[PDB]
Amino acid sequence: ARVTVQDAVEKIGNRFDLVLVAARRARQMQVGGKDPLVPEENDKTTVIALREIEEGLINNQILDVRERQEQQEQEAAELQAVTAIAEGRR
Amino acid sequence: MHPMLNIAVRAARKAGNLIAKNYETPDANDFVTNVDKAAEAVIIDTIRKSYPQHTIITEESGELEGTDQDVQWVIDPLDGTTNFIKRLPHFAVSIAVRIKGRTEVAVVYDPMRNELFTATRGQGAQLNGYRLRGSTARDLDGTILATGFPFKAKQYATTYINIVGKLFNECADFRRTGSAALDLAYVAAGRVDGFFEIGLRPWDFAAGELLVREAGGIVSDFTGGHNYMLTGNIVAGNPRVVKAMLANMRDELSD
Amino acid sequence: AMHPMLNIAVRAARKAGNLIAKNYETPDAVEASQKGSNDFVTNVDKAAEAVIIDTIRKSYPQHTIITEESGELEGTDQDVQWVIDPLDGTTNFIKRLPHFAVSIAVRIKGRTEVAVVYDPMRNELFTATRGQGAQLNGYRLRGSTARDLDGTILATGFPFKAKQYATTYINIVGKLFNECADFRRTGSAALDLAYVAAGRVDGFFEIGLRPWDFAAGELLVREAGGIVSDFTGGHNYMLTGNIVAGNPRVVKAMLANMRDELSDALK
Amino acid sequence: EFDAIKIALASPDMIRSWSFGEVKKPETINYRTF
Numbered sequence: 001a002r003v004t005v006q007d008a009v010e011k012i013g014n015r016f017d018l019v020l021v022a023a024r025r026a027r028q029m030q031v032g033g034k035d036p037l038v039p040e041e042n043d044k045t046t047v048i049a050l051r052e053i054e055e056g057l058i059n060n061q062i063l064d065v066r067e068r069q070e071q072q073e074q075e076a077a078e079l080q081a082v083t084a085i086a087e088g089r090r
Numbered sequence: 091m092h093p094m095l096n097i098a099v100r101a102a103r104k105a106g107n108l109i110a111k112n113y114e115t116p117d118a119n120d121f122v123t124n125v126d127k128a129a130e131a132v133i134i135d136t137i138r139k140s141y142p143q144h145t146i147i148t149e150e151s152g153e154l155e156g157t158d159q160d161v162q163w164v165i166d167p168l169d170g171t172t173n174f175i176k177r178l179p180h181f182a183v184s185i186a187v188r189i190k191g192r193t194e195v196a197v198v199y200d201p202m203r204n205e206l207f208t209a210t211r212g213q214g215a216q217l218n219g220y221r222l223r224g225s226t227a228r229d230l231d232g233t234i235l236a237t238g239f240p241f242k243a244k245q246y247a248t249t250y251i252n253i254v255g256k257l258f259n260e261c262a263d264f265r266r267t268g269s270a271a272l273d274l275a276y277v278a279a280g281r282v283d284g285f286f287e288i289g290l291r292p293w294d295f296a297a298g299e300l301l302v303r304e305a306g307g308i309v310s311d312f313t314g315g316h317n318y319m320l321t322g323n324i325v326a327g328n329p330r331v332v333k334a335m336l337a338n339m340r341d342e343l344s345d
Numbered sequence: 346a347m348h349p350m351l352n353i354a355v356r357a358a359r360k361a362g363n364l365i366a367k368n369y370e371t372p373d374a375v376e377a378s379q380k381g382s383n384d385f386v387t388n389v390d391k392a393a394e395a396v397i398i399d400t401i402r403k404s405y406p407q408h409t410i411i412t413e414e415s416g417e418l419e420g421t422d423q424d425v426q427w428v429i430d431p432l433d434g435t436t437n438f439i440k441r442l443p444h445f446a447v448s449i450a451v452r453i454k455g456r457t458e459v460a461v462v463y464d465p466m467r468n469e470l471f472t473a474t475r476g477q478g479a480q481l482n483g484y485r486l487r488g489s490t491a492r493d494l495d496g497t498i499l500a501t502g503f504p505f506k507a508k509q510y511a512t513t514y515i516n517i518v519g520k521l522f523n524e525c526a527d528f529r530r531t532g533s534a535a536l537d538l539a540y541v542a543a544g545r546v547d548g549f550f551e552i553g554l555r556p557w558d559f560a561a562g563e564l565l566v567r568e569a570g571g572i573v574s575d576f577t578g579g580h581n582y583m584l585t586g587n588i589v590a591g592n593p594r595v596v597k598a599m600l601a602n603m604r605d606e607l608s609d610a611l612k
Numbered sequence: 613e614f615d616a617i618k619i620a621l622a623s624p625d626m627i628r629s630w631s632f633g634e635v636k637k638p639e640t641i642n643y644r645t646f
């Protein structure tokens with residue numbers, strides 16, 4: 001249920017950065033969809049992202065650190081696999 | 091010397107066939123590496139079927155071992171890649187088989203002109219049934235230098251420039267087709283008198299150095315030593331011109 | 346259709362190149378003699394020049410001919426010239442280095458109209474006629490679409506006949522090696538020009554070239570999108586023999602880079 | 613792909629470089645054969 005964006009722009013003191021980070025999070029939740037944190041009400045991913053923003057648990061830093069954690073896990077797993085293959089080829 | 095050479099020749103045949111086939115998809119930086127990987131992979135299959143014991147050494151895959159670590163396969167599926175990137179047809183496949191800390195089998199195959207140079211240590215290096223008798227020049231008079239600009243070793247840029255300047259003051263002319271392996275094959279077959287390049291790599295010259303030495307020539311580094319295997323600094327040709335070149339090029343080096 | 350004089354020229358160049366290939370596989374039949382600096386000239390030059398002259402006179406018994414050997418054979422007419430090099434890179438054919446070509450171009454009122462170069466070893470046939478373009482064995486030629494001096498390949502020639510510029514030349518090359526990726530050196534001006542027009546090398550330049558060593562390639566690189574000039578941006582390159590050629594961007598960048606390194610004698 | 617626009621005159625060599633040929637005849641399309 002989104003009718004305004006004032007709470008969101010309060011959590012991010014600029015409408016421009018607001019829509020930017022919210023579109024980034026919505027793209028996350030739409031393609032390669034991370035599960036939406038706030039329980040959706042059968043709504044589009046856009047308002048889901050806005051709600052997750054205004055609730056106070058999504059912002060620029062949170063998105064960046066989540067991306068970095070994903071990078072770390074991904075690199076650790078794939079490097080373990082490549083070392084296993086390296087032993088398998090010898 | 092017969093079976094190893096036959097296997098290597100068939101491998102170079104398949105590599106050149108695939109390369110020339112893929113040479114007909116015109117496009118105007120990545121797919122060149124893709125067909126490179128593909129030729130390397132079919133080479134790898136040739137290595138696995140025939141003699142699965144030997145070990146492979148490629149610029150791409152590093153070194154992939156089996157059980158017989160005493161037989162290293164140094165296979166560059168492409169030399170002078172930029173040429174094939176620009177459709178300029180001067181490129182070849184370079185197969186080498188080193189045994190007991192020493193190169194023994196060498197093959198360089200250009201699929202465009204169908205140039206298939208083979209080399210076994212001792213009995214020498216043939217081409218299509220012909221023996222490469224090196225160059226006839228005794229000095230740097232009127233000779234040609236298979237010169238190579240270090241487009242990967244820009245640190246020695248100015249030094250190399252001063253060196254080639256002294257040379258062209260003394261020598262006659264250069265050549266550079268942008269293919270180290272084929273440059274070595276050509277200086278081996280007397281097509282160009284002398285050769286010298288900076289910052290090369292074992293998978294590049296692994297076969298060409300033997301092709302040269304079997305042709306009444308020598309291969310060395312810029313200081314007459316034998317560490318050119320890894321220092322990447324190579325000068326080659328029949329001994330007369332190599333001596334005449336070193337005597338002029340020593341006194342402006344940095345290594 | 347196909348330009349008439351272009352057809353005659355390409356037939357003549359085909360015959361000359363077949364004779365060249367014939368002389369190639371016999372490292373015995375070549376009986377050369379030194380004429381200049383660090384280069385011979387062979388009997389094969391004379392044979393090919395004779396074949397070309399005869400084939401031309403067959404269908405053109407009055408056109409003027411120009412050649413390094415016969416100088417200028419002034420036919421009864423003097424507006425239609427045929428600049429001929431039966432061999433570019435005779436040094437390479439001496440050492441049997443399989444990289445050379447025959448070159449034939451036609452000047453009308455001083456303007457090059459048709460031009461061909463022929464590499465018999467790879468059976469490559471660079472044709473080019475004015476106002477219609479350049480073709481490689483049936484494919485169009487647009488030259489390298491590179492837009493700057495980065496990653497480019499630069500074809501060049503060392504002045505084995507005028508080695509005085511060498512030092513200067515060296516500096517030039519040195520300066521260029523600061524930006525460009527790699528150079529190319531085949532000892533064959535015509536094939537360098539062709540490759541430029543072929544988009545195989547992204548730029549060419551040479552100090553002190555002979556008039557009949559580019560008059561065929563220059564039309565190729567012209568009608569293949571590229572431009573030619575001297576080292577100062579002018580059109581006097583036909584006299585100075587100082588050539589730069591390639592797509593407009595790389596030529597402009599090379600000229601801007603070389604404006605300083607060059608010497609006043611060349612400008 | 614870019615961050616600027618340059619504009620200036622075009623040398624005759626430049627213009628001839630752009631072209632892929634030289635038009636010579638005025639008539640455009642034959643009507644008995646389109």
Ligand SMILES: [Mg+2]
Pocket residue numbers: 149166167168169170
């Ligand atoms: Mg390689």
Ligand SMILES: [Mg+2]
Pocket residue numbers: 413430431432433434
């Ligand atoms: Mg000539």
